[PDB]
Structure formats: C-alpha cells, structure tokens
C-alpha cells in the first residue's frame, strides 16, 4: 500500500534510482482519519508489536484546560473557526491538532461563580473562603467579554487520529490577540 | 557442510627439461641410493629450497631480535635431531651449505645397508617393503622413513618373520612337505 | 541490454518449438509405434526371456502368442511399441529384420562367450549396413553367482568387449535387477533414434496385414516412415524385385494416374 521508503526518491544530485527490492512490511503507512463532529464512533487498529491505536471518526465532547485557573472540565465542542494548514478543513469542520474551535462556556462559569462567589458577567463556611480568594478574582477583559455569548475560543492539543480523543486549552493571552487579528482579517 | 580438509603439493619440476648436464647428475644419485624416480629427487630439493628461504629471511633480522632467537633455534634444533646437520656446525650460517646428499644419507633404506643386514641398496629396499625390518617394536615398511639419531640402536629384524625367529615362509614349508611325503614313499 | 536479452529469448522459443515438432510423431496412442528388434548373440539365451523380463516392469499384466510380431501399448509411459523377433536360423533374415528397426537390443550371455564364427559376424555386418540405435542387455548373470562381486567381475568384462564395437556406449544393463530393466524400458519409450541416411530418403512401410486380389492386386496396410510416397512411384520388395502400385488410400484414395514411370 502506502510506503514510507526513501528508495523511490531522486538522489540529491538529481540521479534516478533503480528498484532495489520489493516493498517491505515494516515500512508501511495508512489512510487518514479525517475526524468530524458528530456522535462518538471509534475504531481500533492492530499495530506493530501487537499494540493498539484508536482511530476516532466522530466526536462531540472533550477535556479542556483553564490554564491560568488550573482546572479542567469536560465540555461540548461547537465548531471549527480557523486552521493554519488548510482552509478546506474549516469548511468541513474537520478536527486535527492545532485547530481553533469554539466550546460551550457554561461548565466554566458554574465553577467560577461558586469558587470566587462573584458573578462573571450565604453561610459562614462559604463567606470565609470567598474573602480569602477575593484578591485573585480579576480576569482578562478579552476573556470575560466572551462569556456573554456562551462560547470560548480553544486550541486542540491532542492528536485525534492517533489516540481517539480531543483535548485542548482556552486561548488566554498574546495568543488570543494574534488569532483575533487573523480571524477578523 | 563440514569444514574443508586442507592439502598441499610436495614437489617441484625443473624449469628447463633438457639441460644435459643436470640429467647426468641426477642419474648418479638414483644409481647410488637406489631410487626409482626423479620425483624422489625433486621432493628433497623442494624441501631444501624452503629451509634456505626461511633461514635467509632470518639473517636480515638483527642479532638479539627476539624472533630470530626463537625461530632460528627451533630450526637448528630440528635438523640436528635427524642428523642432517652436525652438532659441530650448530650455527645458522651453515644451514645455507647443506646439499641433497645430506638428506638421502638418512633414509631408512640406506641405513639398513650401512649397518649390514642387507648387502646392497637394492637388497635393502626389498627387505623393508616385505616387512622384515623393525625400529623398536614397530614394523616399518616405508623406505623414505627418516631415522632420528636415537633410533639407530634399535634397527633389527622383526619378531614375526624368518630371519627374526618365526616359522619358515610359505615356500620353504611346501618344499619340506613334498620331500617328507616323498621320503615316506 | 534489453534488446540483447529479447533476441536470445525469442531464439530459444524457436528451438523449443522445433523440438516439439520432432516429438509429435511418437506422442501417444494416436501416434506411430516404435520398432524394436531383439537379437540374441548366443543360442543359449532364447529371445523370449529378454522380452518377458522387459514386460514385467511395465507393471500391467494385461500386457502379458503363436507369433513373432507383437503390438503393445504401455500405460506407464503412454507409448506404442512394435516388437519384431527374427528367425535366428536364417542369417540373411536377421539383416533384413534389423535393417528396419529403430532400436536393436543385443542379448549377451554371462555363461558362454560369443563365438567368432557366427556371433561376431552378426555385429560386424550390422554396423556396416548402419544401425539406428543400439542397447546392450544381460539377462542371466545370476547363473554364475557366488557373490555378486563375482557377477561384477563378469559384467566389467562384457562392457569392455561391447564398447569395442559401440564406443558411444559405456553401460550394459542387467535385467535381473528391477532398477536396470525399468531404466531400459523408459529409454525405449522416451528417447528418439538416430536417422538412417540411405533409408529415410526413401519411403518404407511395414505390413500390418496383407491381402490378395486378381495378375494379382496385393493389398498392404501399415504406417509410412520414410520421406513419403506418391502413387506414381515404383516399389521394391527385397526378395522379389520391382513392382508398380496402382492405388493408395488413407485409413481419401489416390490412384496411379498413368503420367508415371514404367
């Protein structure tokens, strides 16, 4: 099938090469996953040594990190908005590593308003905790203004076709400014 | 497959076939020592050739070179043992002065003549091939056997022959029987 | 390099096709029979012992009678054989029989050696008229058994004698051994004979049957083996001289069209 051999290429001088040997099994490749947003569908593939890979086909939820707050939540993925390698991936809503996506914000708000006791837009045990934390309740304005619409920008950091699952982190600082310019341009 | 058996050729052919002066010298040796072939002469001159090649090589090495000491002493020791070189001439420069007659003189065929027992080199050869001579206990039947200096004391008729003390041979027995039978007539 | 290789390949294709064209004549029961003749060089032997020991190794007893010509098909090699036995009383009839054979099987005796006044003269005469091919055979070597090394001593003597007349051959088979007799049978089936130059430039046939009609019109049926026949030819029969054929048919008819030699 697909082969990863170097034998078929020209040499660096430009010379053409003759065929040395038939294709070996230890140098094969396989076809892409092209995973889409949908409802969970995962197959598995038997790899060298008897190990396993998981080949995600359809996915709908992932694990995302609020890195400056230090917490992770499971949440639903809404769609693909920008991709550095190829604009066709945006049209098709194909998920790969380094895609930029929007995610449902509500699990993070519910955490925040309980943890700091303050709206993001009752008993002594609670008030004492909020008072200690209150010094850290400030948040980046470029992030906070997103919560009115219910969606946040995030970047995919796992490889879905190799591991079967889609994980990432929320855009947070200089990165957020960069992609906002690219995205409005 | 099993490892190869090694073998080598033991004689060399003179490079000019009809050099008349050489033909005369060879025939005198064969008549003197009772040889059957020129090959028996070629064999000896082939051995003598290699001894000189080795000795001549060592003489390029300085004295007290450890290799010249070790291998030079071995070669001299080994020729003295058979009596080809006198223990007076026990020095490496004299090895270059040996000649063919020094080796032929040591063959069992000629020693059995010099000791008596036989009465010509032609008579001596017949006895050896017919199994009458022993060296120590062992019957020997090869004329070219090189007699080492220790063995000369122990050359004698074999125990299992006439001349050595056994029963008369097949023809003597037949004659006695017919005459005895006729004497009964 | 490619066209070098290509030429060599398509040349080999011709050679191989040519080898088939030769062999098709013997290819099977639909093909022609091969003519074998047995000639014992000593009256001690009786030729029926020779043939019988051969037929055993065919491994079909349905093969194995008031006659001296036999037609056999051998299933084991899909081969058609005709055996002719001459009458060993008529010296001249031996030459005539052997003159038509593809294979002559020489029988040798381990017990009694060939006599110069008769036995050798058979061999010498056959060589000088020419022989399509020859095989040396022994059938009775166990009659001098003491140990088979004593049999080998005799067999070596017979081979040295036989090779004097036929230096192309270096083996004489012992039919008392199954391996040899099978080897002989295989050769007769599989191998092609030499041609005979003076014969094959003429046509010849051997009679399967003969019939007479009214001064006569003698009918013969058989198989063509030479260069061929034409109805306008002339035909020689060795004991009787020349005669004219009037018709031919194929088992279409051909007739002597009188625009012919006389």
């Amino acid at each position: 099938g697909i082969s990863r051999d170097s034998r078929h290429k020209r040499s660096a001088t430009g010379a053409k090469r003759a065929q040395f040997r038939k294709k070996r099994k230890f140098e094969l490749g396989r076809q892409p996953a092209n995973t889409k947003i949908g409802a969970k569908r995962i197959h598995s593939v038997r790899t060298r040594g008897g190990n396993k890979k998981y080949r995600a086909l359809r996915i709908e939820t992932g694990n995302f990190s609020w890195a400056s707050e230090g917490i992770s939540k499971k949440t639903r993925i809404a769609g693909v908005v920008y991709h550095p390698s190829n604009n066709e991936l945006v049209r098709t809503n194909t998920l790969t590593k380094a895609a930029i996506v929007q995610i449902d914000a509500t699990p993070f708000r519910q955490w925040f308003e309980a943890h700091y006791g303050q709206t993001l837009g009752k008993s002594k045990n609670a008030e004492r905790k909020w008072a200690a934390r209150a010094a850290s309740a400030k948040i980046e304005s470029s992030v906070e203004s997103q919560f009115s619409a219910g969606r946040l920008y995030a970047c995919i950091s796992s490889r879905p076709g190799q591991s079967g699952r889609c994980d990432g982190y929320i855009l947070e600082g200089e990165e957020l400014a960069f992609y906002l310019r690219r995205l409005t341009a | 497959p099993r490892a190869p058996r090694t073998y080598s050729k033991t004689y060399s052919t003179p490079k000019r076939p009809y050099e008349s002066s050489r033909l005369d010298a060879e025939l005198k040796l064969a008549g003197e020592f009772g040889l059957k072939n020129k090959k028996e002469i070629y064999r000896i001159s082939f051995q003598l050739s290699k001894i000189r090649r080795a000795a001549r090589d060592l003489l390029t090495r300085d004295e007290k070179d450890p290799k010249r000491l070790f291998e030079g002493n071995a070669l001299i020791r080994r020729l003295v043992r058979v009596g080809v070189l006198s223990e007076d001439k026990k020095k490496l420069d004299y090895v270059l002065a040996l000649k063919v007659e020094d080796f032929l003189e040591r063959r069992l065929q000629t020693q059995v003549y010099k000791l008596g027992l036989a009465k010509s080199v032609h008579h001596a050869r017949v006895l050896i091939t017919q199994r009458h001579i022993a060296v120590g206990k062992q019957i020997v039947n090869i004329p070219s056997f090189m007699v080492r200096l220790d063995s000369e004391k122990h050359i004698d008729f074999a125990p299992t022959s006439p001349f050595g003390g056994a029963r008369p041979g097949r023809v003597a027995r037949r004659n006695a029987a017919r005459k005895a039978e006729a004497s009964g007539e | 390099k490619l066209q070098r290789k290509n030429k060599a390949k398509q040349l080999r294709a011709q050679r191989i096709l040519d080898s088939i064209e030769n062999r098709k004549l013997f290819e099977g029961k639909n093909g022609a029979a091969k003519i074998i003749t047995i000639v014992p060089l000593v009256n001690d032997l009786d030729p029926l012992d020779i043939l019988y020991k051969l037929l055993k190794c065919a491994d079909d007893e349905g093969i194995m009678d008031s006659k001296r010509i036999f037609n056999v098909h051998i299933k084991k090699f899909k081969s058609n054989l005709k055996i002719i036995i001459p009458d060993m009383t008529n010296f001249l009839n031996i030459l005539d029989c052997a003159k038509v054979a593809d294979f002559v099987v020489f029988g040798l005796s381990g017990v009694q050696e060939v006599d110069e006044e008769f036995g050798e003269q058979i061999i010498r005469a056959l060589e000088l008229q020419g022989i399509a091919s020859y095989i040396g055979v022994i059938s009775n070597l166990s009659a001098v058994h003491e140990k088979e090394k004593f049999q080998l001593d005799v067999k070596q003597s017979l081979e040295s004698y036989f090779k004097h007349f036929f230096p192309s051959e270096e083996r004489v088979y012992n039919l008392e051994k199954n391996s040899d007799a099978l080897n002989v049978l295989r050769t007769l089936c599989q191998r092609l004979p030499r041609s005979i130059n003076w014969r094959d430039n003429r046509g010849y046939v051997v009679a399967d049957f003969v019939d007479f009609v009214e001064s006569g019109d003698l009918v013969i049926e058989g198989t063509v083996r030479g260069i061929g026949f034409n109805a306008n030819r002339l035909v020689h029969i060795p004991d009787f001289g020349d005669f004219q054929l009037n018709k031919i048919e194929k088992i279409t008819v051909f007739e002597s069209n009188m625009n012919r030699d006389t």
Binding site: - | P1, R2, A3, R5, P66, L69, F70 | -
Partner: protein
C-alpha cells in the same frame, strides 16, 4: 532473514570454546539468558569437552534430568544454558564446586573451590537508577536487579552478593591501587593494579594497569573488573596468578620441568 536465527554453524562459534573442526557440521547455540552469547559457556561444552564426564550429547541430557547440576544454587536442565564469568557450578554427588574464571590464555579454566567460597559471587555495577514509586535499584553484569542499594554505590563499582537470599553484603569503590581483572580484548585474563584513568568526554575512557612484574598495558574501561584491594583478592585466583609470560620463558620452563 524474517526473524531470529536458531542455528550456529561450526567455525562461526567462539574460538575460545576449542571445538575441533571435523567432528560435525554444527555447534551448540546458547539460549537467551544472563550472559551475552559471544562470551558465555554452554553447559554441554563444560560437562563433555572439559570434565570428560559425558561421551555424547545424549549422555549430557541424562545427567541434567536427574537434577545433579545446579548453577548459582538453582537447578538447571537446559543443555545450552549460558553460564558465564564468575558463576559458581556445583555437582552435589562427587562433592565438587567450580568457579568460572579465565586462564591467562583467555580460556575458561577448570578451577576448584571450597564448600565455603561457594556461598557468594562478585558483581560489577552497570547502572543505578530510581524505579517506580521512587525506589532505587542497581543492575549487575549478570543481570540481577537489587532493591535499596547503599547510597554510596556508583557505576563501575563492584558488589558482593550472597547466593542465598540474593542481597548485597559488601562493596568496593573503583579507585587507584585496586586489583583488577581484565575481561575482554587482547589482554583478556591479565591481573594488575590501577595506575590512573583517562577521561574522554563523549568517547571511551582508558585505564593504565601495572602487574606485579611491573609490566604496563592499557585497556578500555569497559574491559576492567575490580576484584579487591592490593594484594588481597576477594576470591581465590586460578593457578599462575594471571602473570603473562613471553614465549621464550614458557619454552624454558617446560623443558626444565617437563623435560627435566
């Protein structure tokens, strides 16, 4: 080849086994085990060729299946089990113990030892590292892994192991003035003391050795095995003490003694 190879043709076998050329087409291929193939000694070669207790390969198997032979205190029955340097072999019947150690020619000697010394072996430290849950361990040249080593032990040190229980009882640091055994290369089988070591970053370190006749030689560090303090070997040495002799010296001794 499409996978591992099961056969070893004769002539390709290690030369120090001293097989003859002509007795057959093949040689015993060592099984996977504690020691590297090229420098192990299969049990069949020990029992048959050295001790002469067996005439055939078949008779060797008849011995092992009675469970007479044990290596480092455990019974073994695989004919091609790879014993190696510093192992202890015990034959209970006959009441004999042997330690595998090199002659100065670089061959495994037949060296007999007392019933006391059969309790322990030496091991060279190949690495030291933290395992899971943070437990440290050491690895020896014969592939043992030992939990909780003393924090002083470092690579190239040598360690004394009790064969029962399998626990460390002593160690010696790699340092100048120690005795060493050479276990590879052209100088295989010699014994001497460390003069000094050469550092070569990104390369191979070299060690300078001096023997008791004050000859000197140099070897790669990988070939060096520490065996004790100066003049105090931790084990009994084979006959001849690892002193190399020139060919002239050997000839003189033989004809002096053997030649009277």
């Amino acid at each position: 080849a499409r996978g591992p190879k099961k056969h070893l043709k004769r002539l390709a076998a290690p030369h120090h086994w001293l097989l003859d050329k002509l007795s057959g087409c093949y040689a015993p291929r060592p099984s996977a085990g504690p020691h590297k193939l090229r420098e192990s000694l299969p049990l069949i070669v020990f029992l048959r060729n050295r001790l002469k207790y067996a005439l055939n390969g078949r008779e060797v198997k008849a011995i092992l299946m009675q469970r007479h032979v044990k290596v480092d205190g455990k019974v073994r029955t695989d004919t091609t089990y790879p014993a190696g340097f510093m192992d202890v072999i015990t034959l209970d019947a006959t009441n004999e113990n042997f330690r595998l150690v090199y002659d100065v020619k670089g061959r495994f000697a037949v060296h007999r030892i007392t019933d006391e010394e059969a309790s322990y072996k030496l091991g060279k430290v190949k690495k030291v590292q933290l395992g899971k849950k943070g437990v440290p361990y050491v690895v020896t040249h014969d592939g043992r892994t030992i939990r909780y080593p003393d924090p002083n032990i470092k690579v190239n040190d040598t360690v004394k192991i009790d064969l029962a229980s399998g626990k460390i009882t002593d160690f010696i640091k790699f340092d100048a003035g120690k005795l060493v055994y050479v276990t590879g290369g052209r100088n295989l089988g010699r014994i001497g003391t460390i003069v000094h070591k050469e550092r070569h970053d990104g390369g191979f370190d070299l060690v300078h050795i001096k023997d008791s006749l004050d000859n000197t030689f140099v070897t790669r560090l990988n070939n060096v095995f520490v065996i004790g303090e100066q003049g105090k070997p931790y084990i009994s040495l084979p006959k001849g003490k690892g002193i190399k002799l020139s060919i002239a010296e050997e000839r003189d001794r033989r004809r002096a003694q053997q030649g009277l």
